[PDB]
Design a protein around this ligand. Structure first.
Ligand SMILES: *[C@@H]1O[C@H](CO)[C@@H](O[C@@H]2O[C@H](CO)[C@@H](O[C@@H]3O[C@H](CO)[C@@H](O)[C@H](O)[C@@H]3O)[C@H](O)[C@H]2NC(C)=O)[C@H](O)[C@H]1NC(C)=O
Ligand SMILES: *[C@@H]1O[C@H](CO)[C@@H](O[C@@H]2O[C@H](CO)[C@@H](O[C@@H]3O[C@H](CO)[C@@H](O)[C@H](O)[C@@H]3O)[C@H](O)[C@H]2NC(C)=O)[C@H](O)[C@H]1NC(C)=O
Ligand SMILES: *[C@@H]1O[C@H](CO)[C@@H](O)[C@H](O)[C@H]1NC(C)=O
Ligand SMILES: *[C@@H]1O[C@H](CO)[C@@H](O)[C@H](O)[C@H]1NC(C)=O
Ligand SMILES: *[C@@H]1O[C@H](CO)[C@@H](O)[C@H](O)[C@H]1NC(C)=O
Ligand SMILES: *[C@@H]1O[C@H](CO)[C@@H](O)[C@H](O)[C@H]1NC(C)=O
Ligand SMILES: *[C@@H]1O[C@H](CO)[C@@H](O)[C@H](O)[C@H]1NC(C)=O
Lengths: 344, 728, 49, 49
């Protein structure tokens, strides 16, 4: 569905694959419906015996996917509302939700099952819905989140990375642009900038004896941390700026080069979230209409240069080389249609 | 001294279009506190905000109120917030909402008509209370037998809270069973069926008195027949009757008269009174496989050739069960620190007790087998010493664990019903508890009641204080109808026994009468136990009827009167009940008004919402018997305060130890001028501050039982019900 | 012979929860591993119901 | 679906019964898809053999 978003945003879409995916969607949806809880929740098996309680994280993932499927195609609001109240019922007055564990595997998931991160993925997948940031539940969540950020932050360690960035995104949803950029800067604190782009890891090794092979209880969760960061810098109320989108593009380059040739990425989680972030990247930047750019580069040494970027040459790359030991190089662009420019 | 506490109560099945009330305890330190129960919809936004200053240890009950909403039904998040200067409490759950249906209904002029006749009926509006409301109606109409909507009246409003309509039928319009029906803004629909047909007026209801209930051990049977008439006079003539067993040994299918043994009796009505008969039940073989008795009695009224029948007491069950004791004041519960007693009854057969017949008590897992007998009423009182195990299941019988006559031949139909009842106990980690001795029987009204309770307090105020309160509530109708309080100055460290209360039965309380009451510990715990009372059909706005006496010789000047509230109104009915001898009316009683309702009672939360689950799991790796051997993990099953207050019908917010300390499941997994008969009165009256007396005028050559019905209303009191002035 | 099987486990305190065996050592077992047997009325055996 | 047609034709219709039956219909549609033959045909049972 985030794939379809990719197609639509980037415009690379035929009705054929579109109908194929549609049939895929309806089928997977209903196969999911066979595994739910009559409360509204979801487990890996569920039905044909009430000898269980459903999970949460799953149901939140479900909620999100249901949201976007709504965003194009038809789906019952009843189910989101039921899963929502179910979440609430697994809410504490002051504490967060609880990992009501009924899963089978964890590489499916992109965190450490920390209750705060759990709640965090929940509430953020919530606020992607049309939601009043002043809602009761989410207000309570935000108290969790805020307290949680403080203890993460003032304490030298709070997982140092991912907890913190997901916090960043929920803060982004709020209106708390101040808190947003603050924890954003805390993410930039342990920054992992590269030759031509940036990223983060988890803390580059787990300190305890770990690993050996197969990513056992540790799927390395390396991208989705950046995906939500690619939301983090991005999304706000009015519209975005330079700096946000610069850092975005950096990690976007990290992202697409981190893309896997077999298809997708290392997993489904990272894949979904990257595609969401890239889609909205385009949904801002990629103006399918904006088609009349024009540019001049001017250096004080009158090393002139003139180009154009348009839909017909959309993926073009009009490189041009540069001799002046001192840079005096004044960029200038105009018109319509987004451009990413790179020099070294 | 003790811990700081709070508590706040409310139903789950809210309503709309009125206020609905809950209540609140606060108490214990830094009591300069406030609250607010925030009702805030989940999707989008809305808020029926309410706020309130918080005192201590008092029950003031605020009644917020409700608008309509977007959807008809929904959940609703409730969330409370409390703020003391040094304390607080915020707590939430879900609640049911419902853009309701007002329970509404009709009274008609007739339950029958003939050619060329004219409908006359009325209808009602209501709220939760029966204090009526003013609103507007989409439509009410009439429906032929064939779906042919036969007229319309539309877009009318209710200020009376009733309204009254009419219509003329043509010469030969539709035969069959007519139908008159409504619908509402939401779409709720409702009827008042009836028929149009032809008939000669009956001046006689054949009537009998013959066993409702013959049973197994019956060798013959009593039969009696009585012809009421005009004026209840005694009638002459001939009568014939058919006491009948049903559904015979034949196949019943298309060649076989399923009407099994009909014994036919020919009686000749003497000059006065009643024909009698004693009938033998041999030929019916009141035994294994022959079916319920049906009995048809038919009077050839002389000098008329007319006969009619009344299937009298059709539903006779000749039940294998006999000596059928019955529990009456059977408790649901018991405790490990109480002398309890189920006060128990016995009856047999028809519904009458025997005195002085011995029975056997069975005490199972309390090991109380014993013997007792019957009194004048078959009323008995076992009572049991209790230092026993959790789950108890009880009985006493007059025979033993088998059907003494030829049980398992598959062809025998005798039984002794045996006493059956299950009772549970409280959880109380204090080991302190309450339990009550209700007045468990038919509750009157126009009275009150004192209600004894038994208070057991292990430790009581452990440190606490010398004084402690008592707080009782009676909701009904999913509502709240009354409330109040009490307390006692607590003996240091013992278990002081007995005291009671009062409660009135003015009105406003449904056929339900739940009671609870709970006496808190400032430690942060409480106890309390339930109740239930079969209120009888009783009302707020009182009324009866009275009239200038019976007078034949149609003196037109003739009155009728009612007492009622001083600024009020009445809608009224008279009938020459000849046509309405031929057929009854339909369910015209105050109980009808009661049972029409949305959720007469409320026990158990509604559907969609589930629970209020907690996190506090307590599972040990193993239960840790330091001693004999490690006993493993498993659940329990007993009764709870949470459960008391959910079976109540409702919910509250605290942090006391209410719900049991239930545990997580296993995480690990794999001279006379004919004026109109068949109607006497269809008209309307207002109630001055001293009562009406209308002049409903005499009518000729129409000689019978004439029931006549009354309805009334007011903002301040409510609706109107009272019985028949037979101005014969 | 001594069977201490309660009808229900009488797990006084908060709730009731069922029974099962142990797996622990005994004088009985010390002396059996030792090699021998003895006669004595005392409480040596775990009262295996 | 002919019921829905009726509901829409005779104009007696709300979005709610609509949504309900939509879910019903996607479901039963898919359940039917689980009874086909790969050619395109259908049967009482079909799939899994
Ligand atoms: C792809 O998804 C979009 C929803 O995001 C479907 O609707 C499209 O919405 C976009 C908004 O991003 C529309 O673009 C608009 O263009 C107008 C000028 O015509 C401009 O004023 C707005 O600011 C906005 O940029 C777009 O018109 C609208 N439909 C399209 C793209 O034709 C869209 O239908 C989906 N495309 C599919 C299913 O392939
Ligand atoms: C319900 O079924 C109808 C098909 O009968 C679906 O299409 C609807 O068709 C009707 C015609 O029967 C359209 O009405 C039109 O009104 C215009 C005036 O505005 C008139 O010029 C046309 O001759 C015609 O009478 C209607 O617009 C059209 N869509 C509707 C009813 O919204 C309809 O989609 C179905 N609705 C659903 C999905 O429930
Ligand atoms: C809340 O509900 C009101 C009711 O009309 C609506 O106007 C409003 O848009 C909703 N949200 C907010 C933020 O007020
Ligand atoms: C309010 O209650 C708390 C809770 O026990 C108590 O410790 C305190 O002395 C009281 N007064 C305050 C907090 O000023
Ligand atoms: C039945 O009628 C007889 C007289 O015929 C009377 O003695 C008896 O009390 C009545 N009731 C019975 C027998 O159940
Ligand atoms: C029941 O036991 C009592 C002793 O209290 C005894 O008098 C009576 O005879 C017993 N019942 C029967 C059936 O004998
Ligand atoms: C009931 O008998 C039991 C026998 O154990 C005894 O402990 C208890 O005291 C008796 N009841 C009362 C109220 O004394």
């Amino acid at each position: 569905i985030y794939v379809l978003d990719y197609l639509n945003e980037t415009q690379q879409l035929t009705p054929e694959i579109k109908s194929k995916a549609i049939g895929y969607l309806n089928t997977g949806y209903q196969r999911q419906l066979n595994y739910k809880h009559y409360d509204g929740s979801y487990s890996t098996f569920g039905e044909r015996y009430g000898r269980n309680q459903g999970n949460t994280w799953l149901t939140a993932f479900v909620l999100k996917t249901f949201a976007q499927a709504r965003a194009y195609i038809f789906i019952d609001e009843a189910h989101i509302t039921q899963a929502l109240i179910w979440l609430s019922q697994r809410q504490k007055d002051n504490g967060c939700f609880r990992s009501s564990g009924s899963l089978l595997n964890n590489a499916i998931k992109g965190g450490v099952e920390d209750e705060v991160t759990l709640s965090a993925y929940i509430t953020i997948a919530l606020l992607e819905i049309p939601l009043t940031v002043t809602h009761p539940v989410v207000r309570n969540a935000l108290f969790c989140l805020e307290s949680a950020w403080k203890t993460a932050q003032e304490g030298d360690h709070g997982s140092h990375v991912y907890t913190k960035a997901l916090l960043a995104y929920a803060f982004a949803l709020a209106g708390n642009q101040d808190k947003r950029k603050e924890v954003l800067k805390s993410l930039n604190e342990e920054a992992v900038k590269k030759d031509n782009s940036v990223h983060w890891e988890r803390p580059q090794k787990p300190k305890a004896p770990v690993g050996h092979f197969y990513e056992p209880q540790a799927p390395s969760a390396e991208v989705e941390m950046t995906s939500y960061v690619l939301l983090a810098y991005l999304t706000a109320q009015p519209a975005p700026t330079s700096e946000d989108l610069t850092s975005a593009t950096n990690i976007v380059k990290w992202i697409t080069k981190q893309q896997n040739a077999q298809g997708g990425f290392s997993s489904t989680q990272d894949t979904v979230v990257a595609l969401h972030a890239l889609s909205k990247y385009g949904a801002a930047t990629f103006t399918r209409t904006g088609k009349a750019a024009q540019v001049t580069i001017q250096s004080s040494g009158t090393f002139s240069s003139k180009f154009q970027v348009d839909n017909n040459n959309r993926l073009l790359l009009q490189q041009v080389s540069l001799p002046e030991l001192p840079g005096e190089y004044s960029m200038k662009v105009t018109g319509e249609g987004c451009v990413y420019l790179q020099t070294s | 001294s003790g811990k700081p506490q709070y508590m706040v109560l409310v139903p789950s099945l809210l309503h709309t279009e009125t206020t609905e009330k809950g209540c609140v305890l606060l108490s214990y330190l830094n009591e300069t506190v406030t609250v607010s129960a925030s009702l805030e919809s989940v999707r989008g936004n809305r808020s029926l905000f309410t706020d309130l200053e918080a005192e201590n240890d008092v029950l003031h009950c605020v009644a917020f109120a409700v608008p309509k909403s977007s959807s008809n039904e929904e959940v609703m998040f409730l969330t409370v917030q409390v703020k003391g200067p040094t304390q607080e409490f915020k707590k939430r759950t879900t609640v049911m909402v419902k853009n309701e249906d007002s329970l509404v209904f009709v009274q008609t002029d007739k339950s029958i008509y003939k050619p060329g006749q004219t409908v006359k009926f009325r209808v009602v509006s209501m709220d939760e209370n029966f204090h009526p409301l003013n609103e507007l109606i989409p439509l009410v109409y009439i429906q032929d037998p064939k779906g042919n909507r036969i007229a319309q009246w539309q877009s009318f409003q209710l200020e009376g809270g009733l309204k009254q309509f009419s219509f003329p039928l043509s010469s030969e319009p539709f035969q069959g069973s007519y139908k008159v029906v409504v619908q509402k803004k939401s779409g709720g629909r409702t009827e008042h069926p009836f028929t149009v047909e032809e008939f000669v007026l009956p001046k006689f209801e054949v009537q009998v008195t013959v066993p409702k209930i013959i049973t197994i051990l019956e060798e013959e049977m009593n039969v009696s027949v009585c012809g009421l008439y005009t004026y209840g006079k005694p009638v002459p003539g001939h009568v014939t009757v058919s006491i009948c067993r049903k559904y015979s040994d034949a196949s019943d299918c298309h060649g076989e008269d399923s009407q099994a043994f009909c014994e036919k009796f020919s009686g000749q009505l003497n000059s006065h009174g009643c024909f009698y008969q004693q009938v033998k039940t041999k030929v019916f073989q009141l035994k294994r496989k022959e079916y319920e008795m049906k009995l048809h009695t038919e009077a050839q009224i002389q000098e008329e050739g007319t006969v009619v029948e009344l299937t009298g007491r059709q539903s006779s069950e000749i039940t294998r069960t006999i000596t059928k004791l019955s529990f009456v004041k059977v408790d649901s519960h018991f405790r490990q620190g109480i002398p309890f007693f189920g006060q128990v009854r016995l009856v047999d057969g028809k519904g009458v007790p025997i005195p002085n017949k011995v029975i056997f008590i069975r005490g199972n897992e309390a090991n109380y087998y014993s013997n007792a007998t019957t009194d004048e009423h078959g009323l008995v009182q076992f009572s049991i010493n209790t230092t026993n195990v959790m789950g108890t299941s009880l009985t006493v019988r007059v025979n033993y664990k088998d059907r003494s006559p030829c049980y398992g031949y598959q062809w025998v139909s005798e039984e002794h019903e045996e006493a059956h009842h299950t009772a549970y106990l409280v959880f109380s980690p204090s080991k302190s508890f309450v339990h009550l001795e209700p007045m468990s029987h038919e509750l009157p009204c126009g009275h009150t009641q004192t209600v004894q309770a038994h208070y057991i307090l292990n430790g009581g105020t452990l440190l606490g204080l010398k004084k402690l309160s008592f707080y009782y509530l009676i909701m009904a109708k999913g509502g709240i109808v009354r409330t109040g309080t009490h307390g006692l100055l607590v003996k240091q460290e013992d278990m002081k026994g007995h005291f009671s209360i009062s409660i009135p039965v003015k009105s406003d309380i449904a056929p339900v009468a739940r009671l609870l009451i709970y006496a808190v510990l400032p430690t942060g715990d409480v106890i309390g136990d339930s109740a239930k009372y079969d209120v009888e059909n009783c009302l707020a706005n009182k009324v009866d009827l009275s009239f200038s006496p019976s007078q034949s010789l149609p003196a037109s000047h003739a009155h009728l009167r009612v007492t009622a509230a001083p600024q009020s109104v009445c809608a009224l009915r008279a009938v020459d009940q000849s046509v309405l001898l031929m057929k009854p009316d339909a369910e015209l009683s105050a109980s009808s008004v009661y049972n029409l309702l949305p959720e007469k009672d409320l026990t158990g939360f509604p559907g969609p919402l589930n629970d209020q689950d907690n996190e506090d799991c307590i599972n040990r790796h193993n239960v840790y018997i330091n001693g004999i051997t490690y006993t493993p993990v498993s659940s329990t099953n007993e009764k709870d305060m949470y459960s008391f207050l959910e079976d109540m019908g409702l919910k509250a917010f605290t942090n006391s130890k209410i719900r049991k300390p239930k545990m997580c499941p296993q995480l690990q997994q794999y001279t006379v001028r004919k004026y109109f008969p068949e109607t006497w009165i269809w008209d309307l009256v207002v109630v001055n501050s001293a009562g009406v007396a209308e002049v409903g005028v005499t009518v000729p050559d129409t000689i019978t039982e004439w029931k006549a019905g009354a309805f009334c209303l007011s903002e301040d009191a409510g609706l109107g019900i009272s019985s028949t002035a037979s101005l014969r």
